Here is the input.
Amino acid sequence: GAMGSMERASLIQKAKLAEQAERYEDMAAFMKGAVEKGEELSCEERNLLSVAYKNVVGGQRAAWRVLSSIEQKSNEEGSEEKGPEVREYREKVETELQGVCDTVLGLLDSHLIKEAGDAESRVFYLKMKGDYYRYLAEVATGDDKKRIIDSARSAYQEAMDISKKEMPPTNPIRLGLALNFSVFHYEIANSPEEAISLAKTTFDEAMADLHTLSEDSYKDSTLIMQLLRDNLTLWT
Amino acid sequence: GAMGSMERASLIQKAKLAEQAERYEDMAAFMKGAVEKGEELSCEERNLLSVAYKNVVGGQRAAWRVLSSIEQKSNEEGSEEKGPEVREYREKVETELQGVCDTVLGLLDSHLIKEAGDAESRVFYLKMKGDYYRYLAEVATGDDKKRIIDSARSAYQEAMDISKKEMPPTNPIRLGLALNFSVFHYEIANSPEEAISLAKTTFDEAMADLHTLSEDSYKDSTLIMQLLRDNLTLWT
Amino acid sequence: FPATV
Amino acid sequence: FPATV
Ligand SMILES: *CC(=O)NCC1CCN(C(=O)C2(Oc3ccc(Cl)cc3)CCOCC2)CC1
Ligand SMILES: *CC(=O)NCC1CCN(C(=O)C2(Oc3ccc(Cl)cc3)CCOCC2)CC1
Ligand SMILES: [Mg+2]
Ligand SMILES: [Mg+2]
Ligand SMILES: [Mg+2]
Ligand SMILES: [Mg+2]
Ligand SMILES: [Mg+2]
Ligand SMILES: [Mg+2]
Here is the structure.
């Protein structure tokens, strides 16, 4: 670990600086360093970790999609042969993306999840596990594709089961988990009806619980509820 | 060179793919590889090189400014001490930026400039030399600051002298060179009157030559002329 | 592309 | 910040 010599508090401080500077690769490296100190993460610290890697991998995914589209076009009839370069470069970006996902999943397995006893932390990390298997699934084309998909599904399902037992239907982690699991169903599992059902049920159960909330909690919950509605509008 | 085994044509092809994917670090590495093949660059190839490094360093500069601002605030009266982290991280970003500038200047010195005999190529590379010394100047605080500034000035001046002899006043390279040298005067050389004079004279001489142009050449030239006007409006 | 968080 | 190209 290149961050092994840096104080945990310094790593967290620098992660926050890197966020302000929009230096998400640095932010992720700082947070990896912080995780590798071996202490549990606070809520704020979990969010730094998630924001960092979300941005890094989000960029990789966007690039991979550009490249995959170019590659697909190259394999249509009437497309003049351009050699191996498009495939090679798509592979390069893919391998880097897979590496980032493996890094994140590694942190979750060693040892964030096993030490996470509170619902809020355990659901947060299992959602992440689902998310990073989902990203691996987006680029999977071979023997292990089904097992990657099932790994995502299993993580999301464990998260759902805990969140339903332990958190109110308006909890932002519970909402965000459902949002993403719904997308998993639509985009990965070829289960659009399950995706729609999930988004709808999640929205309605949240709606019914808004009355219990402060103005600030209301703002947080309704924001994600709008994302559910946005997806529903896209899909129906 | 990690790109030593890849074909020059493949490097250029991949640089174009990386541009489409907004993967500017990769784009820059591909173009560095292409330069290091030792052949002169075409106009298109020069533009790929410049676009790649402009984007990489532009990101670094933006981050450095965020960090420098935070650092400056930390050294105001009534600012509570937060330790070395802000300075360390600003230094980290700075060192990376300096490294990219040194890489670019290295390519220009070994051996792009010396092989560039046509006005269009030689002015293009000397403008780049000026630009990357200007970026080094933006972060310079020590013994060599004056020499860095003079290195930028000297490169820009050689470029200006060639461009005035060999190119029409509407040539986009000539315009862009003047635009950037004007900014050098305003931001680096503490010479706002020189900056204003240069931008104004460049604008007016271009205006008078527009009549000679095709519609497409007109579009290219007037775009940069508007950047000159934008700066003038900012400064007056 | 659909919304995720 | 002023315009450069
Ligand atoms: C520790 C903790 O409670 N983390 C979640 C916290 C509240 C919810 N939240 C958000 O509202 C936004 O991002 C997420 C991120 C992850 C998850 Cl699982 C849910 C929501 C950030 C602001 O835009 C809306 C979503 C993150 C911080
Ligand atoms: C080989 C060559 O002629 N290169 C310049 C070429 C025309 C000008 N041009 C542009 O118009 C924009 O960018 C630059 C970049 C560098 C310089 Cl020196 C001048 C202008 C790109 C489009 O937005 C306006 C400026 C670049 C390609
Ligand atoms: Mg310690
Ligand atoms: Mg692969
Ligand atoms: Mg159900
Ligand atoms: Mg060859
Ligand atoms: Mg320094
Ligand atoms: Mg003069």
Q: What stands out?
A: The pocket of magnesium ion (ligand 6) is lined by residues B 7-8 (CB under 6 Å). The first helix of chain A runs from residue 8 to 20. The interface with chain B takes residues 10, 13-14, 17-18, 20-23, 26, 62-63, 66-67, 70, 82-83, 85-86, 88-89, 92-93 of chain A (CB under 8 Å).
